[PDB]
Structures are given as structure tokens and as C-alpha cells.
């Protein structure tokens with residue numbers, strides 16, 4: 001039995017077409033429609049209860065708690081199906097792909113994502129710059145949350161999941177996107193993605209911080225924020241050991257220009273040690289030597305980046321200290337990422 005969770009705000013002119021084509025695609029099968037409307041200044045909450053004659057439609061309206069992810073959480077609570085399908089009422093999400101979503105869940109996947117960006121997937125009547133802010137955020141997600149590194153459209157509002165995935169789980173009401181909360185905090189072993197087409201208005205830069213604020217939150221939960229802190233404490237530890245050996249070498253008659261080289265190299269080694277027994281102690285794999293060599297490529301990558309970022313900022317007219325500092329900060333940035341996805345890959 002399938003519950004099709006449709007959260008709404010000001011959506012009257014679609015419920016007809018919506019329910020018609022939901023029912024059309026699911027003809028015969030055991031399904032319901034749980035609608036969660038947050039007291040719409042629109043007839044929606046009433047028109048749905050109206051349409052509950054032709055179509056299997058439950059309608060909960062709430063007067064005290066609103067928000068999309070807030071709804072879907074309740075949409076889970078108030079459902080009664082073996083499989084949840086979540087989508088949007090506007091019809092940007094086609095009810096006809098819903099049968100693919102469940103079939104996929106039938107053949108053993110825990111979560112079936114309706115995906116813009118798998119082979120088969122399409123986006124139309126979207127401009128290039130709105131099309132690629134998308135792939136760019138998605139790209140911040142996949143890199144920053146290694147759990148979902150391999151998911152093409154992990155920010156979809158259109159997905160199906162077994163009821164088990166999200167039960168006994170405190171999903172977060174605020175979270176900007178609920179499918180994300182689920183991929184991070186839910187219980188599962190398999191995820192597929194189904195190709196669909198995004199069907200036939202702007203959004204300020206404030207929600208961009210809201211999306212990023214979500215990702216920072218997922219990160220604290222996942223422990224990455226914790227790792228990054230410790231990684232930084234080593235980084236400082238290395239910045240110290242680099243200098244301490246330099247002084248120790250110039251004073252023993254090693255010309256600074258020769259001296260710097262063992263200095264930096266013992267500094268890369270020091271860094272490797274403490275990261276491999278503190279920050280990424282959990283996720284070590286294979287040869288320690290192969291991990292060591294990996295770390296070197298990451299150090300080097302961090303340095304090449306510091307350099308390039310510094311000069312490009314300078315040439316843009318940025319103050320040398322800001323430019324030097326932004327150089328260091330994006331250097332720890334890239335060094336971490338590579339270490340996280342290559343040196344200690346998972």
C-alpha cells in the first residue's frame with residue numbers, strides 16, 4: 001500500500017489534474033494521498049477534502065506549525081503505507097514516473113530518488129544559469145557529505161522510500177531539504193535514481209545560506225565538522241614542526257635553502273602521523289605507505305592552490321594580507337577534501 005505525501009501551500013488549480021493522473025498511473029493498486037496544508041489563504045485545504053470523493057485523499061490542515069520539511073515529517077506521521085512517495089503538487093513532478101519509483105523500491109532498493117540528473121533525466125524551460133546553480137549546489141553537497149558522494153540529485157523533492165528508512169529517526173523540521181536529512185540520518189543500504197523530466201520566478205541569496213546552513217548541520221551530525229577541527233589542529237602542529245626543524249637546521253650549518261627541504265618534509269610527515277591516528281583514525285585502509293604517498297599529493301595540491309589563489313586575488317586588487325590569508329584557508333580546504341576522498345577514501 002503506498003502513501004503519496006503531497007504537502008501544499010496555495011495549490012488549487014492542480015489538485016484536479018494532479019489526482020487524476022496519480023490515480024491514472026496507480027490504477028488498481030493500494031494507495032492513498034496524504035495532503036498536508038498549512039492553513040492556505042487559498043481554497044486548497046477545503047478543495048482537497050472536496051476532491052476526497054473521486055480520489056483516496058486524506059487532508060490534514062494545521063494552523064500552528066508550517067514549513068515544507070515540517071510538513072513532510074508530519075506527512076510521514078499521518079501516513080499508513082508500506083511505501084512513501086513524496087512529491088510536489090504543481091506538476092513539475094510527473095505522477096506517471098511514480099510507477100518506476102515503486103518498481104525500483106520493489107526490486108530491492110531502500111530509497112528511489114526521482115532524479116533530474118541521471119542518464120535519462122532532463123530539465124526543460126529552465127535557463128542555463130539557474131540550471132547550473134543547481135549542479136553547483138548539488139556538487140557542494142556530494143563533496144562535503146561523503147555519504148552521498150555518488151548521488152546525482154540528492155536534493156530532489158521527488159522520491160519514494162520504504163516506511164522503515166525514516167521511522168525511529170529524528171528528521172529535522174527546519175532542514176532545508178528533507179531528502180537530504182533522510183540520506184544522512186535514515187536507515188538504508190541501497191539507493192537508486194530514476195530519470196525524469198522537470199516539467200513546464202527567482203530565489204534570493206538568503207535561501208542559499210539556508211541550504212548551506214543545512215549542509216553545515218548535516219556535517220556536524222556526520223562528524224565531518226569534528227574531523228575538520230582536528231585536522232586543523234594538526235595543520236597548526238605542522239606549521240610549528242616545520243619551523244622548529246628549520247631553526248634546528250640553519251644553526252647546525254645547514255644553509256636555510258637546503259634546510260627548508262628536510263624541514264617541510266618532516267612537517268608533512270608529522271602531519272601524516274597525527275591525522276592517521278586522530279582525525280581519520282576510523283577510516284584507514286590498505287598500506288600505510290600508500291596512504292602516506294596520498295597525503296603528499298594532498299600537501300602539494302594545497303600549496304599549488306595557496307599560490308594560485310594568492311596571486312589571482314592580488315591581481316584583483318585585494319590586500320596582500322587578506323589575499324595571503326584566503327590563500328591559506330582555501331588551502332586547508334582543498335587539502336582536507338583530497339585527504340577525505342583519496343588518502344582516507346570511503
Ligand SMILES: CC(C)=CCC/C(C)=C/CC/C(C)=C/CC/C(C)=C\CC/C(C)=C/CC/C(C)=C/CC/C(C)=C/CC/C(C)=C/CC/C(C)=C\CC/C(C)=C/CC[C@@H](C)CCOP(=O)(O)O[C@@H]1O[C@H](CO)[C@@H](O)[C@H](O)[C@@H]1O
Pocket residue numbers: 088092132133134136137138139140143144155156157158207208211212228329330332333334336337
Ligand atoms: C577551490 C577549493 C575547493 C576551495 C575549498 C572550499 C571550502 C573552503 C572547503 C573547506 C573544507 C570543508 C568545507 C569540506 C567541504 C567542501 C565543500 C563545502 C565545497 C568544496 C567544493 C569546491 C569549493 C567547489 C569550487 C572549487 C573551484 C573554485 C575550483 C576551480 C575549478 C572549477 C572549474 C571551478 C568551478 C566553480 C565551482 C563549481 C563553484 C561551486 C558552487 C557554485 C558557485 C554554485 C552554488 C549553488 C548553491 C550554494 C545555491 C543554493 C542551492 C539552491 C539551488 C537551492 C535549490 O536547489 P534546487 O532548486 O535544484 O532543488 C529543487 O527544488 C525544487 C523546488 O521547486 C524541486 O522541485 C526539485 O525537485 C529540487 O528539489
Ligand SMILES: Nc1nc2c(ncn2[C@@H]2O[C@H](COP(=O)(O)OP(=O)(O)O)[C@@H](O)[C@H]2O)c(=O)[nH]1
Pocket residue numbers: 007008009010011036037038066067068071087088089090
Ligand atoms: N504545507 C506546505 N507546503 C509547501 C510549503 N512550501 C512549499 N510547499 C509545497 O511544496 C511544493 C513545491 O515546493 P516549492 O516551494 O516549489 O519548493 P521549496 O522552494 O523548496 O520550498 C508545492 O506543492 C507547494 O505547495 C509549506 O511551507 N507548507
